Write a protein that binds this ligand. Sequence first.
Ligand SMILES: CN[C@@H](C)C(=O)N[C@H](C(=O)N1CCC[C@H]1c1nc(-c2cccc3ccccc23)cs1)C1CCCCC1
Ligand SMILES: [Zn+2]
Length: 90
Amino acid sequence: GPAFPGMGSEELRLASFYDWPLTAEVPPELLAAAGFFHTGHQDKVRCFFCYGGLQSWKRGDDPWTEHAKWFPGCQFLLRSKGQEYINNIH
Ligand SMILES: CN[C@@H](C)C(=O)N[C@H](C(=O)N1CCC[C@H]1c1nc(-c2cccc3ccccc23)cs1)C1CCCCC1
Ligand SMILES: [Zn+2]
């Protein structure tokens, strides 16, 4: 199951980005959709399912792409995007 079941709701994840410092650069909507919640410190986020953390986001970074790049074994990623998507990023 998920590492952090309490953040399984996309809406709750989205709410966590109220203080996100990079709204124009990396949309909270896309981050939340990709399983990420905001830790509250800087631009650090974490996936609710695999608990993978990502920081130092660059403008135009795609949350789903980054999820697959760094945490290809995440089952939420797999269920959401499929194996073909993950394979093509590598
Ligand atoms: C350019 N696009 C971004 C999204 C990206 O690729 N970030 C990578 C990343 O966050 N990584 C690479 C794998 C692990 C993770 C990291 N995670 C942390 C980290 C350390 C300590 C506490 C943390 C808390 C929350 C999230 C990440 C944390 C540091 S680096 C990495 C950042 C540093 C420079 C190389 C790339
Ligand atoms: Zn994940």
